[PDB]
Structures are given as structure tokens and as C-alpha cells.
Design a protein around this ligand. Structure first.
Ligand SMILES: Nc1ncnc2c1ncn2[C@@H]1O[C@H](COP(=O)(O)OP(=O)(O)NP(=O)(O)O)[C@@H](O)[C@H]1O
Ligand SMILES: [Mg+2]
Length: 216
């Protein structure tokens, strides 16, 4: 029986779109800091559910372990960052990953134009879009307590989509799937992922596990 699924397509807020275009169409050295930014987001989401669970322990019914997993896939060219943090409601996805203006966007594009290192992006409140230094397409699957599981996706170009996810259930948290550009496949190698976690993410207060598919 054919299934029916609803999709909604949204426009990025105009300066977020301009920043995405700037990130994608300009050369930056130091692209490896995307991983730091995504791990920081996962750590922030883990802090949220940790503190929520102190006032309501049933918020951990959807899984007690608080951790971050990194999953490179050399066959389909994706790098996946999974956490068991708070997750995002449908409204959170829409608001927080693209529709609401961020006050630091303009400042950051001025800084980049003046020659700032792309590493400065976190300072400006727009760290997630560092994913587009290395990824042509990003898919965010997320499950928050008392909302359903949703998938956000964008290949930039000014729009993103949100749909209810009918894929593999996660109990609670967020998975960010980077579909890597062809020249950024270094970030599938275990050595390189270890190097950059050690460089940039060594004081995160939750365990990180790197899962490496047996070499083919
Ligand atoms: N893994 C995640 N779990 C839950 N929410 C997330 C996750 N990643 C991103 N978000 C949300 O997306 C928003 C935008 O993230 P981001 O662009 O990194 O900015 P920020 O983390 O708020 N500040 P910063 O990265 O320090 O510049 C966050 O504030 C969260 O609400
Ligand atoms: Mg961030």
C-alpha cells in the first residue's frame, strides 16, 4: 500500500542564507572546526536533558545514557554525529535551524570578509552552519520527549525541508548526517577524526565513541 508523507519547505532567513552562500562559495582553511561545533551542540543538548531530568526523572524514560557517537561511512560518504541530548521539537527545528534571524550573522560575515579564521563562527551564534564547510547536504534527525521524530534537511540554495521521520526510531536526541563533499573525505578516516577531537574537543563532559566499520 503506497504511503503518504507530508513535507514542508521553508526559506532560510535572508542573512542566514547569505552566510551559507559565503561558507559554501569561499575558500577557507581550517575547515576541521566543523566537528568541534557539532560536538559542542551535542554537549549543550546533553546538559539540557541532564538538568531537566533533575526536576523530572521520567524525562530519561527515553534513555538514561548521555553520550555522543561519531559514525563515518566510507561507502556512502557520510559522517554522522549522534547524541542522546534533549532533541528538538518540530517548532525548535524550524525556529532554531533557519527561520529566526541570529543577531551575530551580520557581524560574522563582516569579520569573514575582513579575513577572520572560520573558527570564529561559534563566537557568533551560528556554529551549526560550519557543517557546510564540508557537507553538500545536511540531514538532522531529532526526537524530543513528547514530540514525534522529525527530519530536517538542506542542500543550501536558500531552502530546507522538515518532515515527520518514518526512519529508524531514536529514543531521544539528535543525529546530524553530513553528506560530504567529494574533496572532504578525509573526515571519514579514523585517524583524522581522532586528531581533530583531540585538538578541539578534548574537554567535553560526556563520553564520545568513534565507531569504525571494518575496512573493506
Ligand atoms: N545536537 C543538537 N541538539 C539539540 N539542539 C541542537 C543541536 N544542534 C543544534 N541545535 C539547536 O540549533 C541551535 C543553533 O545551533 P548553533 O548554530 O551551533 O548555535 P548555538 O549553539 O546556539 N551557539 P554557537 O554554536 O556557540 O555559535 C542551537 O541553539 C540549538 O537550539
Ligand atoms: Mg553551537
Amino acid at each position: 500500500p503506497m504511503e503518504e508523507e507530508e513535507v514542508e519547505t521553508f526559506a532560510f532567513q535572508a542573512e542566514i542564507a547569505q552566510l551559507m552562500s559565503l561558507i559554501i562559495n569561499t575558500f577557507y582553511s581550517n575547515k576541521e572546526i566543523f566537528l568541534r561545533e557539532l560536538i559542542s551542540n551535542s554537549s549543550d543538548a546533553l546538559d539540557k536533558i541532564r538538568y531537566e531530568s533533575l526536576t523530572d526523572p521520567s524525562k530519561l524514560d527515553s534513555g538514561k545514557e548521555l553520550h555522543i557517537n561519531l559514525i563515518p561511512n566510507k561507502q556512502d560518504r557520510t559522517l554522522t554525529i549522534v547524541d542522546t541530548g534533549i532533541g528538538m521539537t518540530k517548532a525548535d527545528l524550524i525556529n532554531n535551524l533557519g527561520t529566526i534571524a541570529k543577531s551575530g550573522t551580520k557581524a560574522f560575515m563582516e569579520a569573514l570578509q575582513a579575513g577572520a579564521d572560520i573558527s570564529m563562527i561559534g563566537q557568533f551564534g551560528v556554529g551549526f552552519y560550519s557543517a557546510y564547510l564540508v557537507a553538500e547536504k545536511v540531514t538532522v534527525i531529532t526526537k524530543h520527549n513528547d514530540d514525534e521524530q522529525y527530519a530536517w534537511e538542506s542542500s543550501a540554495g536558500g531552502s530546507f525541508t522538515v518532515r515527520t521521520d518514518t526512519g529508524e526510531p531514536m529514543g531521544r536526541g539528535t543525529k546530524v548526517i553530513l553528506h560530504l563533499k567529494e574533496d572532504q573525505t578525509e573526515y571519514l578516516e579514523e585517524r583524522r577524526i581522532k586528531e581533530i577531537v583531540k585538538k578541539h574537543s578534548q574537554f567535553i563532559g560526556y563520553p564520545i565513541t568513534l565507531f569504525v566499520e571494518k575496512e573493506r
